[PDB]
Amino acid sequence: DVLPPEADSSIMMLTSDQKPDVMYADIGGMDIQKQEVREAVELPLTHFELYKQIGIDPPRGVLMYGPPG
Amino acid sequence: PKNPDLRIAQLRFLLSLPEHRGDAAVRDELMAAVRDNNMAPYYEALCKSLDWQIDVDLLNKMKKANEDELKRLDEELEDAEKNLGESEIRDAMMAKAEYLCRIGDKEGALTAFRKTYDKTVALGHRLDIVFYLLRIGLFYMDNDLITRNTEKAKSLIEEGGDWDRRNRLKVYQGLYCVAIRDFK
Amino acid sequence: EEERSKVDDLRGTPMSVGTLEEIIDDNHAIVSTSVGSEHYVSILSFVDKDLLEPGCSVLLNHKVHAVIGVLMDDTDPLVTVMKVEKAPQETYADIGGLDNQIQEIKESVELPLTHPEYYEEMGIKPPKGVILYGPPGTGKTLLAKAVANQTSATFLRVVGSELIQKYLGDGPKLVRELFRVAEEHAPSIVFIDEIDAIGTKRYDSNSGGEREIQRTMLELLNQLDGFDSRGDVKVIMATNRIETLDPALIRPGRIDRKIEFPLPDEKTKKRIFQIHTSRMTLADDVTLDDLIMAKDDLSGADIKAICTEAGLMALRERRMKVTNEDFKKSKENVLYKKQEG
Amino acid sequence: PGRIDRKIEFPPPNEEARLDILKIHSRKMNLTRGINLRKIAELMPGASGA
Ligand SMILES: Nc1ncnc2c1ncn2[C@@H]1O[C@H](COP(=O)(O)OP(=O)(O)OP(=O)(O)O)[C@@H](O)[C@H]1O
């Protein structure tokens, strides 16, 4: 018989329920990075069909660089 | 390259049912018959409409000039097929071949369609072929072959995604749903 | 007979393929197989123990790690690069103007091996190879002498310093194996063209350095000098610029013969056009005098490319015969190519 | 040394080359037909194909 799923193995999942540290009210400086990330993360995650309507394939690729800061 | 023939379907339906219209409905039809050299489409209407008098040499020199225009492309392919390429020959013949069957009946079209379906590696010309099946499906009010290629085109289209041809198909299924009775 | 039905029961059915580590005069051989395992094997059969030598692949019978038979398996990375073949249709008779240049190298490559009777009785024996070069970008015209050589004996071509210095070395060992494999295929010809080892600017990938590059080249000289190998594996060197290579390389080889490639004259260029256009069909109005007069310092492949582009342009009209107006208009394309930048 | 290879130039994007290719990439995204492809391409000189 196979794995349920999913009972792992390793990592594991969860552990993030008692976290995270602070909300997003902290960093307000960027505002041009958040407009990219928010649209590249929470919008495709909330509505999968809205992209198929307009005929644009939402990517999953998010790359960040520049530190410091 | 469709509406000149589509309005002919309009005028054939305009002539068929009412027997009271003997003037403006035949005049525009002959106006479109003297042009594009529609040959087979007017025989079925010649049995219902008047037999004249004379057509004969007027449309015989036009169908012989259409056969000279037909045989000049048929004489261009074997000089073209001596050289070789990708689609540059077989696609050169099919468009004018479906226009040459636009002159008459379903024959040259139905052979050209299954001919070009094995040529094109993209859906661009495929769905164009489908549109030819739909326009002829309206002329001969034959709903048999238009329900098939449409089902096959929707799968190649949505693999996949489109704008112009997608919204086109949205109207096509509306024309079929209004041909039969589907209101919703 | 009965031995075939006997020894097979000892090795089979399963068996492993290991490597030989070292041999002991007690007929116990130490074998190494995946991964990191040792043993004492003593077998008196199928050996061939003297020809094996450590560093070769041997079988391992499960019980117990015994070697029934010897396996020499190639394959191998380097053995793949020597063949095959070509045996090209081109000959040394398809080139002209270098008759005075070619006479000595053709003689030097056919000096040994074929026509040995006047060589062996004279007791000369200069088996150090030959060295080629020329301007501006030729050396392929000297390769047009290697095609005739490919028609005879065995040939191998190793060109470019990238094959060593692209990564860290281990230096020459890649060349060191070429020597010995060519010794197993002796007689064979090894040709090297365009040696940039000292002429390169930027190394490939991440490797260093300018002076380590030199040391792998120097070990190539001692390999080539050499102490002590009499085998051939005849070696031929060629490049564009001989001034880059160090004079340290000339005494071991080639001390007897090196050739220089001169620029072709009017008579030679006429011959060249003759040889290429032999197979081609040209219009009656094409003359060979004005063509070579208008051209200044061009090799065979230049007059080749202008004909190739003339036939390519003639394919647009689907004509097998190239007219002189089409030929000149096509010629102006390569003429404008070299003159654009 | 001019020997041997085939010479083919890679052209920069052109206006008339921008029109058709614009439609091509516009084939996958739902839009109305009130869009003027003539004026939109002239506003983008140079740049690149990508
Ligand atoms: N006299 C001649 N007769 C016939 N062919 C000739 C003659 N001289 C030169 N050629 C041809 O012209 C060609 C010249 O080659 P070329 O020098 O262009 O090569 P290359 O591209 O420079 O090689 P590399 O880049 O390795 O230096 C040769 O292949 C040779 O066959």
XYZ file of C-alpha atoms and ligand atoms in Angstrom:
675
model
C 0.000 0.000 0.000
C 1.063 3.572 -0.683
C 1.392 6.698 1.449
C -2.068 8.124 2.480
C -0.878 11.027 1.546
C 0.742 12.735 3.277
C 2.602 11.450 6.338
C 6.171 12.209 5.144
C 9.279 11.327 5.777
C 10.874 14.630 6.687
C 10.834 18.431 7.193
C 7.712 18.541 8.229
C 4.744 20.754 7.249
C 2.815 22.971 9.706
C 5.172 24.395 12.446
C 4.140 27.762 10.983
C 0.782 28.005 12.789
C 2.253 29.326 16.041
C 4.317 31.686 13.850
C 5.193 34.185 12.081
C 6.796 37.032 13.999
C 5.118 40.217 12.744
C 2.591 41.342 10.144
C 3.420 43.402 7.051
C 2.839 46.803 8.684
C 6.567 46.680 9.524
C 8.132 47.302 6.117
C 6.378 50.073 4.208
C 9.382 51.396 2.338
C 9.497 49.330 -0.864
C 5.903 49.492 -2.183
C 7.183 48.799 -5.701
C 8.453 45.351 -4.715
C 5.233 44.430 -2.904
C 3.127 45.369 -5.929
C 5.134 42.829 -7.944
C 5.190 40.120 -5.278
C 1.558 40.462 -4.150
C 0.361 40.224 -7.764
C 2.808 37.324 -8.322
C 1.733 35.384 -5.211
C -1.628 36.048 -3.589
C -3.608 36.920 -6.731
C -2.799 33.695 -8.655
C -3.365 31.720 -5.467
C -6.815 33.151 -4.738
C -8.364 32.956 -8.247
C -7.042 30.308 -10.622
C -9.801 30.761 -13.209
C -9.474 34.527 -13.582
C -6.150 34.006 -15.365
C -7.655 31.415 -17.716
C -10.391 33.902 -18.592
C -8.008 36.582 -19.859
C -5.744 33.906 -21.349
C -2.538 34.645 -19.414
C -0.652 31.749 -17.821
C 0.374 32.807 -14.308
C 3.978 31.875 -13.549
C 5.158 30.370 -10.294
C 8.644 31.816 -10.661
C 9.692 34.381 -8.057
C 13.318 35.532 -7.929
C 14.791 38.034 -5.475
C 18.243 39.584 -5.214
C 20.049 42.733 -4.151
C 21.152 42.308 -0.570
C 22.095 44.395 1.241
C 19.698 45.668 2.307
C -13.891 35.364 -48.819
C -17.097 34.096 -47.226
C -19.754 36.819 -47.074
C -20.045 36.939 -50.919
C -21.101 33.262 -50.708
C -22.952 33.522 -47.380
C -25.243 36.207 -48.782
C -25.831 33.787 -51.650
C -27.142 31.322 -49.070
C -29.254 34.248 -47.826
C -30.686 34.808 -51.319
C -31.318 31.089 -51.901
C -33.363 30.957 -48.717
C -34.988 34.222 -49.834
C -35.977 32.620 -53.159
C -36.931 29.161 -51.901
C -39.741 29.718 -49.389
C -41.671 32.690 -50.849
C -42.912 32.107 -54.369
C -44.155 35.716 -54.555
C -40.746 37.388 -55.059
C -39.754 37.213 -58.727
C -37.629 40.345 -59.184
C -35.212 41.814 -56.628
C -34.389 38.347 -55.257
C -33.262 36.917 -58.603
C -31.471 40.116 -59.654
C -28.986 40.259 -56.774
C -28.412 36.509 -57.105
C -27.461 36.840 -60.776
C -25.409 39.886 -59.761
C -23.348 37.561 -57.546
C -23.485 34.740 -60.120
C -21.823 36.730 -62.913
C -18.964 37.308 -60.436
C -16.727 34.781 -58.656
C -18.022 32.381 -61.344
C -20.252 30.320 -59.069
C -20.946 27.220 -61.165
C -22.461 24.279 -59.262
C -24.406 26.442 -56.723
C -26.826 27.804 -59.347
C -27.865 24.445 -60.840
C -30.024 23.554 -57.835
C -31.472 27.073 -58.131
C -31.884 26.732 -61.901
C -34.254 23.820 -61.358
C -36.382 25.939 -59.002
C -35.922 29.306 -60.744
C -36.397 29.854 -64.469
C -34.431 27.887 -67.059
C -34.044 30.959 -69.326
C -33.506 31.044 -72.644
C -29.700 30.794 -72.633
C -26.900 30.458 -70.112
C -24.637 28.039 -71.979
C -21.670 29.776 -73.595
C -21.828 32.706 -71.159
C -21.045 30.406 -68.218
C -19.284 27.742 -70.314
C -16.486 30.114 -71.315
C -16.338 31.141 -67.638
C -16.110 27.555 -66.394
C -13.545 26.826 -69.097
C -11.632 29.924 -68.023
C -12.042 28.644 -64.461
C -10.654 25.312 -65.617
C -7.752 27.087 -67.310
C -7.218 28.940 -64.019
C -7.550 25.551 -62.304
C -5.134 23.747 -64.606
C -2.617 26.586 -64.377
C -2.237 25.958 -60.636
C -2.394 22.210 -61.239
C 0.379 22.901 -63.785
C 2.230 25.062 -61.233
C 2.434 22.354 -58.551
C 4.522 19.816 -60.484
C 7.004 22.541 -61.405
C 6.844 23.605 -57.750
C 7.148 20.048 -56.383
C 10.349 19.562 -58.413
C 11.921 21.950 -55.930
C 11.088 21.221 -52.300
C 10.363 22.903 -49.004
C 8.203 22.904 -45.904
C 4.538 23.455 -46.846
C 5.554 26.032 -49.461
C 3.933 23.906 -52.207
C 1.050 22.004 -50.641
C -0.136 25.163 -48.871
C 0.150 27.141 -52.105
C -2.285 24.763 -53.817
C -4.897 24.243 -51.074
C -6.143 27.824 -50.645
C -6.945 28.252 -54.324
C -8.133 24.626 -54.309
C -10.848 25.431 -51.763
C -11.657 28.544 -53.767
C -11.837 26.325 -56.862
C -14.331 24.192 -54.945
C -15.963 27.437 -53.862
C -16.834 27.571 -57.565
C -18.740 24.313 -57.214
C -20.053 21.487 -55.013
C -18.175 19.933 -52.070
C -15.606 17.794 -53.900
C -12.341 19.706 -54.324
C -12.890 21.079 -50.834
C -13.416 17.718 -49.124
C -10.316 16.271 -50.769
C -8.280 19.425 -50.085
C -9.287 19.401 -46.402
C -8.094 15.893 -45.574
C -5.101 16.757 -47.766
C -4.037 19.800 -45.736
C -4.897 18.279 -42.345
C -1.709 16.194 -42.647
C 0.359 19.218 -43.771
C -0.047 22.037 -41.235
C 1.862 21.567 -37.988
C -0.138 24.363 -36.305
C -3.802 25.142 -35.628
C -3.699 28.415 -37.604
C -4.624 26.890 -40.956
C -6.418 23.920 -39.377
C -9.118 26.078 -37.823
C -9.295 28.077 -41.065
C -10.165 24.789 -42.764
C -12.771 24.283 -40.029
C -14.269 27.688 -40.907
C -14.569 26.515 -44.497
C -16.513 23.495 -43.215
C -18.779 25.829 -41.251
C -19.563 28.198 -44.133
C -20.338 25.258 -46.414
C -22.347 23.788 -43.534
C -24.522 26.897 -43.710
C -24.874 26.807 -47.512
C -25.964 23.183 -47.749
C -27.577 23.358 -44.254
C -25.624 20.168 -43.489
C -25.010 19.921 -39.742
C -23.222 16.560 -39.954
C -19.609 17.599 -40.500
C -19.751 20.888 -38.573
C -20.331 19.254 -35.169
C -17.203 17.102 -35.552
C -14.356 19.400 -36.597
C -15.549 21.953 -34.034
C -15.217 19.404 -31.230
C -11.750 18.540 -32.546
C -10.706 22.195 -32.822
C -11.726 23.116 -29.268
C -9.149 20.624 -27.955
C -6.262 22.022 -30.023
C -7.334 25.576 -29.128
C -7.567 25.264 -25.328
C -4.343 23.270 -24.800
C -3.499 26.139 -25.165
C -5.346 29.430 -25.323
C -6.552 31.982 -27.855
C -8.181 35.365 -28.324
C -9.544 36.014 -31.804
C -10.352 32.447 -32.845
C -11.733 31.643 -29.383
C -14.240 34.514 -29.415
C -14.956 33.517 -33.038
C -15.920 29.994 -31.969
C -18.110 31.539 -29.261
C -20.198 33.042 -32.090
C -20.074 29.843 -34.157
C -21.679 27.702 -31.460
C -24.283 30.452 -31.188
C -25.083 30.106 -34.885
C -25.490 26.352 -34.500
C -27.564 26.733 -31.328
C -29.805 29.198 -33.170
C -29.980 26.988 -36.282
C -31.493 24.262 -34.107
C -33.456 25.355 -31.016
C -31.233 26.199 -28.047
C -32.157 29.393 -26.234
C -29.947 29.298 -23.131
C 35.004 -30.713 -24.403
C 34.762 -31.633 -20.698
C 36.776 -28.576 -19.588
C 34.110 -26.229 -21.019
C 31.458 -28.062 -18.988
C 33.761 -27.937 -15.929
C 35.158 -24.417 -15.513
C 31.761 -22.853 -16.245
C 30.304 -24.265 -13.019
C 33.044 -22.493 -11.041
C 32.458 -18.977 -12.359
C 28.680 -18.990 -12.792
C 26.030 -18.188 -12.737
C 26.579 -14.725 -11.190
C 29.947 -13.023 -11.313
C 31.287 -9.536 -10.723
C 33.585 -7.363 -12.805
C 36.374 -5.816 -10.751
C 39.727 -4.156 -11.305
C 43.231 -5.460 -10.686
C 45.128 -3.623 -7.950
C 48.471 -5.420 -7.605
C 50.002 -8.838 -8.208
C 52.107 -10.895 -5.798
C 54.784 -13.395 -6.839
C 52.784 -15.944 -4.791
C 50.148 -16.060 -7.594
C 47.834 -14.283 -5.157
C 46.488 -11.211 -6.952
C 44.909 -8.297 -5.086
C 41.704 -7.191 -6.810
C 39.623 -4.083 -6.190
C 35.935 -3.811 -7.041
C 33.080 -1.462 -6.208
C 33.443 -0.414 -3.652
C 36.836 -0.465 -1.949
C 37.247 -4.227 -1.556
C 40.385 -6.374 -1.623
C 41.167 -10.082 -1.797
C 43.719 -12.773 -2.708
C 42.957 -14.540 -5.996
C 45.128 -17.427 -7.178
C 44.070 -19.109 -10.422
C 46.218 -20.992 -12.930
C 43.651 -20.955 -15.754
C 43.069 -18.617 -18.730
C 46.054 -16.503 -17.584
C 47.573 -14.514 -19.478
C 48.631 -13.272 -16.031
C 51.756 -11.651 -17.480
C 49.847 -9.705 -20.148
C 47.236 -8.436 -17.661
C 49.428 -6.226 -15.421
C 47.800 -4.107 -12.677
C 45.347 -1.433 -13.728
C 43.107 -3.650 -15.876
C 39.632 -5.132 -15.512
C 39.197 -8.686 -14.219
C 36.182 -10.831 -13.433
C 35.089 -11.756 -9.919
C 33.221 -14.979 -9.240
C 30.926 -14.588 -6.228
C 32.690 -17.479 -4.512
C 35.032 -16.286 -3.721
C 36.054 -13.164 -5.652
C 37.942 -15.385 -8.097
C 38.911 -14.254 -11.597
C 37.914 -16.830 -14.210
C 38.620 -14.767 -17.319
C 40.219 -11.565 -18.525
C 38.252 -8.682 -20.022
C 39.669 -5.842 -22.116
C 36.732 -3.612 -23.014
C 36.984 -0.554 -25.284
C 34.807 1.583 -25.825
C 36.931 3.935 -23.629
C 36.603 7.727 -24.044
C 39.733 8.326 -26.116
C 39.495 5.313 -28.430
C 36.244 6.744 -29.814
C 37.874 9.937 -31.138
C 40.366 8.398 -33.600
C 37.928 6.657 -35.982
C 36.377 6.601 -38.578
C 37.948 7.038 -41.011
C 37.638 9.048 -43.315
C 39.153 7.539 -46.431
C 38.037 10.678 -48.299
C 37.442 10.821 -52.017
C 39.808 13.795 -52.278
C 43.397 13.222 -53.351
C 46.635 15.186 -53.478
C 46.008 15.426 -57.252
C 43.088 17.830 -56.706
C 45.456 20.603 -55.547
C 48.030 22.563 -57.523
C 50.753 25.161 -57.227
C 52.299 23.466 -54.175
C 54.008 20.774 -56.278
C 57.355 22.220 -55.191
C 55.991 22.403 -51.640
C 54.199 19.038 -51.658
C 56.973 16.980 -53.264
C 59.003 16.788 -50.067
C 56.138 16.114 -47.646
C 54.500 13.533 -49.923
C 57.925 11.913 -50.150
C 58.413 12.200 -46.379
C 55.094 10.555 -45.522
C 55.578 7.797 -48.104
C 59.307 7.620 -47.267
C 58.686 5.025 -44.511
C 56.144 2.214 -44.697
C 55.319 2.066 -48.417
C 58.325 2.126 -50.734
C 60.584 0.886 -47.909
C 63.143 -0.823 -50.144
C 65.108 2.322 -51.020
C 64.609 3.643 -47.480
C 65.769 0.637 -45.455
C 68.835 -0.062 -47.618
C 70.012 3.546 -47.370
C 69.968 3.602 -43.562
C 68.710 7.154 -43.046
C 65.662 6.788 -40.791
C 64.270 10.245 -39.943
C 61.095 9.238 -38.053
C 60.429 12.512 -36.219
C 57.464 13.546 -38.383
C 56.995 16.844 -40.200
C 55.989 20.372 -39.218
C 53.572 22.490 -41.240
C 52.464 26.115 -41.206
C 51.528 29.081 -43.345
C 49.675 32.412 -43.730
C 47.291 34.003 -43.452
C 44.678 31.539 -42.307
C 45.749 28.492 -44.314
C 46.877 25.170 -42.860
C 43.691 23.596 -44.109
C 45.368 23.732 -47.503
C 48.084 21.728 -45.766
C 45.286 19.492 -44.448
C 44.422 18.948 -48.115
C 47.685 17.023 -47.986
C 46.404 15.057 -44.982
C 43.420 13.750 -46.984
C 45.853 11.976 -49.324
C 47.558 10.622 -46.206
C 44.189 9.463 -44.861
C 44.066 7.195 -47.920
C 47.117 5.316 -46.558
C 47.780 3.474 -43.277
C 46.096 4.814 -40.124
C 45.218 8.436 -39.348
C 44.280 10.397 -36.236
C 43.664 14.154 -35.964
C 43.892 16.020 -32.644
C 43.504 19.782 -33.003
C 43.176 22.718 -30.640
C 44.564 23.276 -27.158
C 41.052 23.476 -25.694
C 41.009 19.695 -25.145
C 43.670 19.995 -22.418
C 43.333 23.390 -20.789
C 39.522 23.692 -20.708
C 39.672 22.308 -17.158
C 42.318 21.566 -14.550
C 44.938 18.928 -15.285
C 46.329 16.150 -15.059
C 47.940 18.168 -17.879
C 49.224 16.115 -20.780
C 47.976 12.699 -19.636
C 45.171 13.085 -22.180
C 47.903 13.320 -24.833
C 50.015 10.663 -23.112
C 47.262 8.131 -23.740
C 47.046 9.195 -27.396
C 50.706 8.238 -27.839
C 50.229 4.709 -26.472
C 46.919 4.016 -28.210
C 48.519 5.073 -31.485
C 51.332 2.664 -30.578
C 48.781 -0.145 -30.349
C 47.506 0.987 -33.760
C 51.025 1.516 -35.186
C 51.703 2.420 -37.852
C 49.391 5.423 -37.580
C 49.573 9.138 -38.358
C 48.775 11.734 -35.694
C 48.167 15.227 -37.065
C 47.924 18.352 -34.913
C 46.757 21.638 -36.410
C 46.601 25.194 -35.060
C 48.468 25.034 -31.740
C 47.274 28.026 -29.706
C 48.681 26.873 -26.337
C 50.996 29.896 -26.199
C 48.783 32.038 -28.450
C 45.556 31.781 -26.458
C 44.391 34.744 -24.388
C 41.565 33.548 -22.104
C 41.455 29.991 -20.804
C 38.207 28.039 -21.058
C 36.013 27.740 -17.937
C 38.090 28.181 -14.733
C 41.692 27.004 -15.029
C 45.189 28.304 -14.487
C 47.562 29.381 -15.452
C 49.639 30.845 -18.273
C 52.734 29.133 -16.856
C 51.006 25.802 -16.131
C 49.834 25.875 -19.764
C 53.506 26.121 -20.712
C 54.448 23.172 -18.500
C 51.875 20.870 -20.071
C 53.266 21.926 -23.460
C 56.833 21.205 -22.305
C 55.839 17.744 -21.109
C 54.329 17.366 -24.567
C 57.834 18.003 -25.928
C 59.449 15.371 -23.695
C 56.697 12.957 -24.702
C 57.508 13.907 -28.299
C 61.309 14.164 -27.987
C 61.417 11.443 -26.616
C 62.861 9.183 -23.899
C 62.366 6.487 -24.597
C 59.995 5.606 -27.452
C 60.868 4.554 -30.995
C 57.258 3.989 -32.034
C 55.265 5.876 -34.651
C 52.502 7.282 -34.259
C 53.985 9.693 -36.776
C 53.344 13.236 -35.527
C 52.654 16.291 -37.692
C 52.343 19.817 -36.286
C 50.726 22.784 -38.015
C 49.701 26.339 -37.136
C 49.250 29.829 -38.593
C 52.077 31.581 -36.735
C 55.309 29.753 -35.947
C 56.741 32.764 -34.087
C 54.509 32.096 -31.075
C 55.894 28.607 -30.454
C 59.128 28.541 -28.519
C 62.395 27.562 -30.251
C 62.693 25.015 -27.431
C 60.353 22.817 -29.508
C 62.307 22.604 -32.779
C 65.381 20.513 -31.913
C 63.426 17.370 -30.869
C 61.059 17.978 -33.792
C 60.810 18.725 -36.492
C 64.534 19.065 -36.997
C 64.665 17.612 -40.541
C 61.669 19.132 -42.351
C 59.379 22.120 -41.974
C 57.483 23.664 -44.874
C 56.193 27.154 -45.522
C 52.975 27.880 -47.413
C 53.445 30.581 -50.081
C 50.711 32.749 -51.511
C 49.448 31.558 -54.927
C 50.381 33.376 -58.130
C 48.342 33.987 -61.283
C 49.163 30.569 -62.784
C 48.277 28.764 -59.542
C 44.989 30.645 -59.054
C 44.096 29.747 -62.641
C 44.748 26.090 -61.780
C 42.608 26.412 -58.631
C 39.606 27.829 -60.485
C 40.106 25.028 -63.021
C 39.941 22.302 -60.374
C 36.846 23.626 -58.595
C 34.882 24.519 -61.711
C 35.701 21.124 -63.281
C 32.500 19.658 -61.824
C 30.557 22.905 -62.124
C 28.917 24.112 -65.316
C 29.678 27.696 -66.300
C 28.558 29.935 -69.122
C 30.716 30.353 -72.212
C 31.367 34.024 -71.409
C 33.140 33.203 -68.121
C 36.877 33.755 -68.580
C 39.601 32.663 -66.165
C 41.971 35.570 -66.882
C 39.945 38.521 -65.574
C 38.819 36.583 -62.484
C 42.321 35.887 -61.178
C 43.431 39.383 -62.215
C 40.731 41.055 -60.095
C 41.569 38.906 -57.045
C 44.590 39.614 -54.815
C 45.860 37.122 -52.187
C 43.073 34.544 -52.082
C 43.251 30.853 -51.210
C 41.389 27.938 -52.752
C 38.421 28.125 -50.406
C 37.748 31.773 -51.304
C 37.293 31.048 -54.999
C 35.363 28.025 -53.702
C 32.918 30.097 -51.649
C 32.243 32.521 -54.494
C 31.264 29.561 -56.688
C 29.120 28.106 -53.895
C 27.235 31.397 -53.557
C 26.953 31.660 -57.344
C 25.239 28.264 -57.435
C 23.127 29.180 -54.410
C 21.957 32.338 -56.176
C 21.419 30.293 -59.346
C 19.115 28.051 -57.302
C 16.776 31.043 -56.925
C 16.308 30.859 -60.709
C 16.717 27.047 -60.617
C 19.563 27.067 -63.134
C 22.430 24.588 -63.110
C 24.599 26.780 -65.391
C 25.976 29.912 -63.710
C 26.121 32.961 -65.971
C 28.982 35.449 -65.759
C 26.701 38.290 -64.650
C 25.356 36.062 -61.871
C 28.920 34.944 -61.126
C 30.205 38.521 -60.841
C 27.214 39.700 -58.806
C 27.787 36.754 -56.458
C 31.544 37.413 -56.356
C 30.760 40.962 -55.244
C 29.042 39.511 -52.157
C 32.136 37.848 -50.696
C 34.190 40.750 -52.052
C 31.964 43.093 -50.030
C 32.141 40.653 -47.101
C 35.911 40.931 -46.652
C 35.724 44.673 -47.409
C 32.860 45.528 -45.023
C 34.892 45.250 -41.815
C 39.166 34.114 -42.990
C 35.924 34.532 -44.908
C 36.261 30.777 -45.345
C 33.868 29.193 -44.953
C 30.371 30.019 -43.693
C 27.019 31.567 -44.670
C 26.409 35.243 -43.878
C 22.944 36.141 -42.566
C 22.217 39.392 -40.771
C 19.949 39.550 -37.747
C 17.805 42.676 -38.205
C 16.615 45.031 -35.474
C 12.851 45.297 -34.971
C 11.105 47.446 -37.569
C 7.719 49.178 -37.549
C 6.086 46.934 -40.157
C 7.888 44.034 -38.477
C 6.300 45.167 -35.184
C 2.702 45.120 -36.468
C 2.281 41.465 -37.452
C 4.383 40.163 -34.559
C 2.272 42.266 -32.174
C -0.845 40.482 -33.400
C 0.975 37.139 -33.074
C 1.750 37.542 -29.384
C -1.699 39.114 -28.914
C -3.385 35.891 -30.111
C -3.503 34.367 -26.600
C -5.039 37.199 -24.533
C -8.708 38.178 -24.586
C -9.255 41.720 -25.869
C -11.717 43.769 -27.899
C -11.081 45.046 -31.437
C -11.056 48.788 -30.728
C -7.257 48.605 -30.473
C -5.253 50.449 -33.141
C -2.167 48.397 -33.964
C -0.827 51.205 -36.186
C -0.328 53.916 -33.573
C 0.819 51.590 -30.805
C 3.842 50.262 -32.711
C 5.283 53.655 -33.669
C 5.469 54.604 -29.980
C 8.093 51.862 -29.453
C 11.188 52.606 -31.542
C 14.198 50.379 -31.095
C 13.853 48.389 -27.856
C 14.038 44.672 -28.785
C 12.053 41.682 -29.952
C 11.571 40.310 -26.444
N 46.084 24.954 -55.191
C 44.903 24.510 -54.701
N 44.122 23.658 -55.404
C 42.946 23.208 -54.929
N 42.448 23.559 -53.731
C 43.127 24.407 -52.924
C 44.418 24.943 -53.372
N 44.866 25.746 -52.392
C 43.941 25.729 -51.402
N 42.910 24.933 -51.725
C 41.728 24.671 -50.885
O 41.406 25.848 -50.153
C 41.119 25.506 -48.800
C 41.717 26.550 -47.876
O 41.255 26.290 -46.559
P 41.260 27.482 -45.484
O 42.687 27.934 -45.299
O 40.183 28.466 -45.859
O 40.780 26.724 -44.160
P 40.539 27.483 -42.773
O 39.058 27.699 -42.601
O 41.469 28.662 -42.721
O 41.027 26.364 -41.726
P 41.427 26.780 -40.229
O 40.275 27.656 -39.803
O 41.522 25.469 -39.487
O 42.742 27.501 -40.396
C 41.690 24.126 -48.534
O 40.680 23.283 -47.978
C 42.099 23.590 -49.886
O 41.383 22.387 -50.174
